[PDB]
Amino acid sequence: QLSSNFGAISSVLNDILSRLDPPEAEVQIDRLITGRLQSLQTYVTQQLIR
Amino acid sequence: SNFRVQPTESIVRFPNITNLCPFGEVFNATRFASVYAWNRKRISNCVADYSVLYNSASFSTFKCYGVSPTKLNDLCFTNVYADSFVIRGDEVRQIAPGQTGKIADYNYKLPDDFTGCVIAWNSNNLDSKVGGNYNYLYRLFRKSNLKPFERDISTEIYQAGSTPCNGVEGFNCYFPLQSYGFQPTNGVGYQPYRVVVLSF
Amino acid sequence: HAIHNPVLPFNDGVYFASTEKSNIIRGWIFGTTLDSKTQSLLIVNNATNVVIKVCEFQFCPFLGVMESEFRVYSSANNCTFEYVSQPFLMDKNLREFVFKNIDGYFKIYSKHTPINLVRDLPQGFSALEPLVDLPIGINITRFQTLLALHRSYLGWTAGAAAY
Ligand SMILES: *[C@@H]1O[C@H](CO)[C@@H](O)[C@H](O)[C@H]1NC(C)=O
Numbered sequence: 001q002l003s004s005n006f007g008a009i010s011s012v013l014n015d016i017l018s019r020l021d022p023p024e025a026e027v028q029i030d031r032l033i034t035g036r037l038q039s040l041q042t043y044v045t046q047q048l049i050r
Numbered sequence: 051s052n053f054r055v056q057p058t059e060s061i062v063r064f065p066n067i068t069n070l071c072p073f074g075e076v077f078n079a080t081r082f083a084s085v086y087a088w089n090r091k092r093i094s095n096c097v098a099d100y101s102v103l104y105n106s107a108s109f110s111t112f113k114c115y116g117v118s119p120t121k122l123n124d125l126c127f128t129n130v131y132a133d134s135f136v137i138r139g140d141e142v143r144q145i146a147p148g149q150t151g152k153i154a155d156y157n158y159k160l161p162d163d164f165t166g167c168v169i170a171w172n173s174n175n176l177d178s179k180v181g182g183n184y185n186y187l188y189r190l191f192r193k194s195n196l197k198p199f200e201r202d203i204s205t206e207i208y209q210a211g212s213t214p215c216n217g218v219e220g221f222n223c224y225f226p227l228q229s230y231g232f233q234p235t236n237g238v239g240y241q242p243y244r245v246v247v248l249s250f
Numbered sequence: 251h252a253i254h255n256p257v258l259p260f261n262d263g264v265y266f267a268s269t270e271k272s273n274i275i276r277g278w279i280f281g282t283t284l285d286s287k288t289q290s291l292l293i294v295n296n297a298t299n300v301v302i303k304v305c306e307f308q309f310c311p312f313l314g315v316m317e318s319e320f321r322v323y324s325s326a327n328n329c330t331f332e333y334v335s336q337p338f339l340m341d342k343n344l345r346e347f348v349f350k351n352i353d354g355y356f357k358i359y360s361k362h363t364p365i366n367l368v369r370d371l372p373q374g375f376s377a378l379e380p381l382v383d384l385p386i387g388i389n390i391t392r393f394q395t396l397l398a399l400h401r402s403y404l405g406w407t408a409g410a411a412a413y
């Protein structure tokens with residue numbers, strides 16, 4: 001799941017950090033954070049049920 | 051807690067070419083073509099300085115879409131594209147991704163995923179004659195919308211009247227090519243402006 | 251298979267591939283209306299280099315004994331782009347070309363593999379590679395393939411090239 005955009009302009013943090021200033025990078029970072037959080041929560045719930 | 055090993059130093063490796071390639075020729079230039087015959091130029095095999103432009107602040111508009119104008123000094127690009135032409139003083143807003151206007155669907159339009167910068171500055175002295183400048187040409191009549199980065203060259207007569215416009219070559223069948231008028235006798239917004247667009 | 255070549259509809263990408271012995275088929279022409287009135291593209295690759303121009307050439311055919319090339323074009327008037335570079339072909343042998351045009355950018359894939367010729371088209375496995383990529387920037391809707399009628403000192407060569 002680490003290769004999904006989730007709506008951002010890319011999938012690698014270092015490209016965003018080397019292409020833009022913080023006021024524009026905040027939104028992409030937020031979208032990525034939300035996606036990865038959702039994936040982790042789903043995995044944990046499945047493990048408990050097993 | 052967790053433990054990591056911190057770095058010791060940093061290294062940088064870059065190619066080994068040194069040529070001050072013609073950024074001057076595109077900007078320092080004698081005479082640009084018309085809007086509907088925009089010239090496309092190639093920039094390659096360079097060591098290009100970008101902040102050197104910022105030492106001469108005479109451009110009214112300097113906006114960039116997919117990259118900040120200060121991080122250009124530590125990046126490597128390929129296929130640097132330059133487009134230069136001159137338009138009226140109130141079509142500068144129309145030069146943007148996804149706009150509605152005459153030249154927006156008749157002469158020029160950028161895609162919706164642009165990556166580059168647009169620069170515009172005024173020229174009302176070198177490009178104006180008190181008798182009126184009528185050497186700048188543009189299209190006003192066309193039945194179709196063109197795709198981005200597409201050039202149209204056609205001096206044919208528009209089929210405009212309800213009758214076949216083959217023997218009707220005068221009125222009721224308008225020629226699609228018009229020419230502007232630039233004078234030092236009018237105010238702002240009706241004066242020529244120089245535009246350069248860079249694509250990465 | 252031509253024995254001693256009109257237009258073929260474009261607009262979905264064209265896969266052109268000859269595999270047999272090839273020293274006859276040389277070039278390709280494109281355009282909206284194939285004439286000297288609207289923008290046209292010409293590509294010539296014969297034995298020494300590649301010559302690419304985008305202009306309104308007079309389509310005057312056979313190519314006898316860099317060689318005699320004025321047959322296809324007479325004069326290039328009022329045009330922008332010119333290009334010359336190293337040739338790609340060589341002089342059994344499968345050659346594959348893919349014509350693409352997106353946003354005005356012209357792609358050309360190439361792939362060459364020496365084989366043994368027993369079938370008109372074998373069952374081999376191929377993966378084409380990108381070689382040349384140019385900013386043509388024009389509107390193309392048909393295409394046509396040249397067949398250079400050489401002179402092997404035989405009043406012309408017995409053309410039997412297949413594609
Ligand atoms: C453009 O021309 C001016 C004229 O003095 C010159 O000073 C400048 O270096 C040139 N190049 C630019 C502005 O990039």
Ligand SMILES: *[C@@H]1O[C@H](CO)[C@@H](O)[C@H](O)[C@H]1NC(C)=O
Nearest residue numbers: 196197200282283389390391
């Ligand atoms: C390209 O030319 C063909 C010629 O018939 C025309 O039908 C088509 O609309 C043209 N396309 C563009 C994008 O100009």
